[PDB]
Every structure is written in C-alpha cells, then in structure tokens.
Scaffold this active site. Structure first.
Site, PDB file in Angstrom:
ATOM      1  N   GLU A  36       0.809  -1.229   0.000  1.00 63.17           N
ATOM      2  CA  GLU A  36       0.000   0.000   0.000  1.00 63.17           C
ATOM      3  C   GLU A  36       0.851   1.293   0.000  1.00 63.17           C
ATOM      4  O   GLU A  36       0.475   2.284   0.641  1.00 63.17           O
ATOM      5  CB  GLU A  36      -0.975  -0.050   1.171  1.00 63.17           C
ATOM      6  CG  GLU A  36      -2.030  -1.137   0.974  1.00 63.17           C
ATOM      7  CD  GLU A  36      -3.084  -1.112   2.068  1.00 63.17           C
ATOM      8  OE1 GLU A  36      -2.798  -0.732   3.271  1.00 63.17           O
ATOM      9  OE2 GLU A  36      -4.237  -1.488   1.771  1.00 63.17           O
TER      10      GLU A  36
HETATM   11  C1  LIG Z   1      -0.420  -6.328   4.071  1.00 61.19           C
HETATM   12  C2  LIG Z   1      -1.808  -5.747   4.332  1.00 61.19           C
HETATM   13  O1  LIG Z   1      -2.777  -6.459   4.513  1.00 61.19           O
HETATM   14  N1  LIG Z   1      -1.937  -4.423   4.393  1.00 61.19           N
HETATM   15  C3  LIG Z   1      -3.180  -3.691   4.558  1.00 61.19           C
HETATM   16  C4  LIG Z   1      -4.099  -4.146   3.410  1.00 61.19           C
HETATM   17  N2  LIG Z   1      -5.303  -3.330   3.551  1.00 61.19           N
HETATM   18  C5  LIG Z   1      -6.361  -3.471   2.511  1.00 61.19           C
HETATM   19  C6  LIG Z   1      -7.583  -2.778   3.142  1.00 61.19           C
HETATM   20  C7  LIG Z   1      -7.282  -2.658   4.646  1.00 61.19           C
HETATM   21  O2  LIG Z   1      -6.998  -1.303   5.043  1.00 61.19           O
HETATM   22  C8  LIG Z   1      -6.030  -3.544   4.820  1.00 61.19           C
HETATM   23  C9  LIG Z   1      -5.121  -3.217   6.002  1.00 61.19           C
HETATM   24  O3  LIG Z   1      -5.695  -3.620   7.254  1.00 61.19           O
HETATM   25  C10 LIG Z   1      -3.780  -3.977   5.937  1.00 61.19           C
HETATM   26  O4  LIG Z   1      -2.949  -3.310   6.896  1.00 61.19           O
END
Ligand SMILES: CC(=O)N[C@H]1CN2CC[C@H](O)[C@@H]2[C@@H](O)[C@@H]1O
Length: 494
Positions: free
Chosen positions: A302
């Site tokens: 992200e």
């Molecule tokens: C590696 C990973 O899952 N990163 C983020 C992926 N995102 C996708 C949507 C959520 O914010 C979620 C978040 O909780 C997670 O921290």
C-alpha cells in the site's frame, strides 16, 4: 472413558497407525528425559502442563520407571518431526531436535482428554490411544502474524498469543511492529520513534512500545515455544508513526501529526533524501541485533503515495541493508514488482479479485526463484469477518467462513507459480478493530488451526468433511483453556 482416537489431532499427522490398548497416565507415572538441559526443558514444560489437572507428582527424571519418555535420537524426522508410540508400556516421543519433542507434546495434549487443560485436579482416566504416529511437516514456513501497531498488545498479551499459536505447530511469529498508528520498538539511534511514535494507537488510546529488554523477553519466550520471530518494519508506506516523530524524514521537512484513524495508502518515506537511508540502516541494524531469527520483513504494501519508479529505487537500496546485517529479506508481494534480491521471500496477500496482471507478476517472481509465503486476504486473514453479522473485523476481502479459510491447497493455488516456490503459509491477525486479547481469540479461533494444518499436514490428509470433525473436537479443550471462539454453523460442535 475410551481414548480420543489417535488420528483426532490438528494438524492431521503425516502417518497414523492405531493399535493395541491405550497408555493410562497414573499416580506413579514419571516423565523420563535424556540427561541434559535441552531435554529437561521439554520435560519440565510437559510436567507443567500435566501436574495441575492430574494432581500427580510427575517428576522429570533421567532414570527409572518412565511412563512418558522424551528422547532425542537420529531418525528420519528432520528438524521438526517426531515419532509418538503409545501403549500399555508407556508413551515415548522420539525426535532429532527439541523442536520435534515439543511438537510431539502438542500432539500428546490433544490426544489426552480436554480436562487435562484445567488448573485443578480432575478425575481420570488419562488415556492416550495405542499405536504409532510418525509426523513431519509439509512446509517449513508456518507462521502467524499479530499487528501490534494498530492496537498495542503488551509483552504478556503477546506471550499469551504465542501460547495460542504454539498449540498448532506454527514455527514463525511475524510481528507487525510499525505502521501509521504506532511504532512499537525502542531504537536508540532514533529515540522519538518509540517515545513519541509509540504514544498512541487507533482510536487515540495510550498505545505503548517494547523497550529493548521487553522485545528480548518476547523473543526468548517465543524461542522457548519454538517460534522464530520475524519482525516487520513496514516501508516505504505505512510509515506515519516514524514520519510524525522526525520532521526531516518527510519530503517537505514537516512532521505530520500522529495518526489514530484506520485509512491506508497516504504515508510515504522520502525516497530521494539520503537521510531516509541513514534511518533505515540504523533501525534495521538495531532490529537485527535483537533478531536471532534469519529474516527481516520490510513490508512494502500500500505504498500508494510512492510513485512506481520511487518504490523500485527504494527497495533497490533497502534490500541490501538486510543482507548487510546477515538476514534474509521478506516483503509483501508488492516487492515482486521491484526486483527482489536473491534469497528474498515475498508474502502474497491478494484475493480472488486481485488483477490477473498482479497475480502474474508474483508468479513471474516465483518462476525466477523468489520464494512465496501465501496468506491470501480472503483465506487466512484472521481479522476478516466470518459473515455480515460478525461484530468485529473487516470485510474488504469479503466474508471468510471456516470452510473457506481451510479448503484450498497452497501447492495448487496461484496460477503459474511453481509448487516448489511455496515456502508455506501465514495467518495474519490485523488489529484496526481489535483492542483486547479476548477479541483476538474470537477472531483467531477456530480458523487458526486450519491454517496451521495447511502448513503442516500432507495434501493426502486434506478433507473438509473429516477435518471439521477434528476441529469440533478441539472445542472442549478451548473451553477448558478459557479460549473464546466463533461457534461457526459450518462445524459439527458436540
Ligand atoms: C499487508 C496488508 O494487509 N496491508 C493492509 C491491506 N489493507 C487493505 C484494506 C485494509 O486497510 C487492509 C489493512 O488492514 C492492511 O494493513
């Protein structure tokens, strides 16, 4: 009472041959171990499990009568497997290493009645079904992640979660110790990261951090449960806590405020400032000194405020810092699009609707020899809601009921990636919505043992209709251990 059947264990053991009368642990049983510290440690661990509910003295000894025998010997069990033999003459657990003895003990506790987990004396009988289990893991990477950045969890709460995962033969504990809402480890070269960056968490609570002594104790405790700690400093995205603590790390030189919300994608380190790499070098060096494990996780998810070419140049510069401290790079699978180094692992967290081009990029890296850890967001994310009615957790990946989390094959999952590239699996527990340990247990159980079985058990044992009966058999043990869990209607609870 009759004995719990020899095969009613999670993970499903690689080979199970039931036969003969059971062993019965009695007032005169002893726990006999080889003559050594490594041996006595596992024996004392086992005695601590058994003494309260049996009320037997159960001395740990190196001579005499035995009854429960833990022995190290050369054999075909590898670093983590064991053989367990049980009958009228006793129970003997044999392995090459302390880790296989400890694994054999986690099997032994599921074979014993649920009353074994109680903290005061219970009626017997204490029966172990007769026969032989021979057991070695399918995959070497069998991990559980806890997010201590979104909400903070104390050293004691992390040790409680270590004891949850140790039940199911996990061998890695991934700790997500930095994100936008907190920085959870004291770094001497950058003292504000923990002192200021650790001062809050999602929702504006008191947050927290591990001192170096706290972090060492977590590592020592996890090692005593045969868990290798894999710490993650997420970069270059999910970095608000660090950026809020040091204005100079920001491209504009202005520190943003500490963040207590749950949005993602908005934070970035400054890729073209050299001081960014002074900061990475210092933090990874200090984390390496506290990490006897082989891996450092640099995150990589992200990075939505980092241009692709900046993300690539960043990972090109940072990955060798990990090798400089003698460790191996792990990143989220976004790293697959940024030249993973030789030896680096990527962790796939995508889901069925992840684009084909993005899946093909991860499979391309696997064909190129990059090892893969599978933890798909619509399979093994333990914070994902079970249904539209679950009161905690998220649903961005859809609803994930117990069958769906279990019923797939890591060897035949990501199109175009060789089976040989799959190092194993992970069950991550994110904490945007979870702020106390009972909440962790409700979201982790009953899916956690399922991911452990995918990591451990042969593919030939994989089967929902018979696994769900082994899973239902865990509930009395959970209840005796005080572990909250979601009573899914997919499972035939007794
Ligand atoms: C590696 C990973 O899952 N990163 C983020 C992926 N995102 C996708 C949507 C959520 O914010 C979620 C978040 O909780 C997670 O921290």
């Amino acid at each position: 009472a009759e004995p719990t059947p020899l095969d009613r264990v999670i993970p499903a053991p690689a080979s199970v041959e039931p036969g003969g009368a059971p062993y019965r642990i009695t007032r005169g049983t002893h726990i006999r171990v080889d003559d050594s510290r490594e041996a006595r440690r596992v024996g004392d661990y086992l005695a601590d499990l058994l003494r309260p509910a049996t009320g037997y003295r159960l001395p740990v000894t190196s001579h005499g009568h035995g009854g429960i025998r833990l022995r190290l010997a050369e054999g075909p069990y590898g670093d983590e497997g064991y053989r367990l033999d049980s009958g009228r003459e006793g129970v003997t657990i044999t392995a090459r290493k302390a880790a296989g003895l400890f694994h054999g003990v986690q099997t032994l506790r599921q074979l014993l009645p649920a009353a074994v987990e109680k903290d005061s004396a219970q009626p017997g009988p204490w029966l172990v079904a007769g026969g032989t289990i021979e057991d070695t893991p399918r995959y070497a990477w069998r991990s559980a992640m806890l997010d201590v950045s979104r909400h903070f969890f104390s050293v004691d709460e992390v040790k409680r979660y270590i004891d949850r995962v140790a039940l199911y033969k996990y061998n890695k504990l991934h700790l997500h110790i930095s994100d936008d809402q907190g920085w959870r480890l004291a770094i001497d070269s950058w003292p504000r990261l923990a002192t200021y960056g650790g001062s809050t968490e999602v929702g504006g609570g008191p947050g927290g951090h591990y001192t170096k002594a706290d972090y060492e104790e977590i590592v020592r405790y996890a090692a005593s449960r045969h868990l290798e700690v894999v710490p993650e400093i997420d970069m270059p995205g999910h970095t608000n806590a660090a950026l809020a603590s040091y204005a100079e790390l920001n491209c504009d030189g202005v520190a943003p405020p500490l963040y207590t919300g749950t949005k993602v994608g908005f934070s970035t380190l400054c890729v073209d400032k050299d001081v960014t790499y002074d900061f990475v070098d210092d933090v990874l060096g200090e984390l390496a000194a506290l990490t006897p494990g082989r891996y450092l996780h640099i995150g990589g998810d992200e990075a939505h405020s980092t241009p692709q070419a900046d993300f690539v140049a960043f990972m090109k510069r940072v990955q060798p810092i990990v090798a400089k401290y003698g460790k191996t790079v792990v990143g989220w699978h976004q790293l697959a699009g940024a030249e993973p180094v030789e030896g680096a692992l990527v962790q796939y967290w995508g889901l069925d609707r992840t684009s084909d081009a993005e899946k093909a990029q991860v499979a391309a890296a696997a064909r190129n020899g990059t090892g893969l850890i599978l933890s798909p967001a619509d399979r093994t994310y333990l914070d994902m809601k079970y249904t539209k009615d679950t009161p905690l957790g998220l649903s961005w990946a859809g609803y994930v009921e117990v069958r769906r989390s279990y019923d797939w094959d890591p060897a035949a999952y990501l199109p175009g990636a060789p089976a040989e590239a799959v190092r194993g699996v992970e069950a991550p527990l994110w904490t945007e919505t979870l702020s106390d340990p009972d909440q962790l247990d409700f979201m982790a159980f009953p899916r956690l043992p399922g991911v452990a079985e995918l990591g451990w058990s042969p593919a030939s044992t994989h089967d929902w209709d018979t696994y769900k009966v082994r899973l239902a058999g865990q509930a009395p043990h959970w209840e005796a251990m005080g572990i909250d869990y979601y009573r899914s209607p997919q499972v035939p609870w007794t």
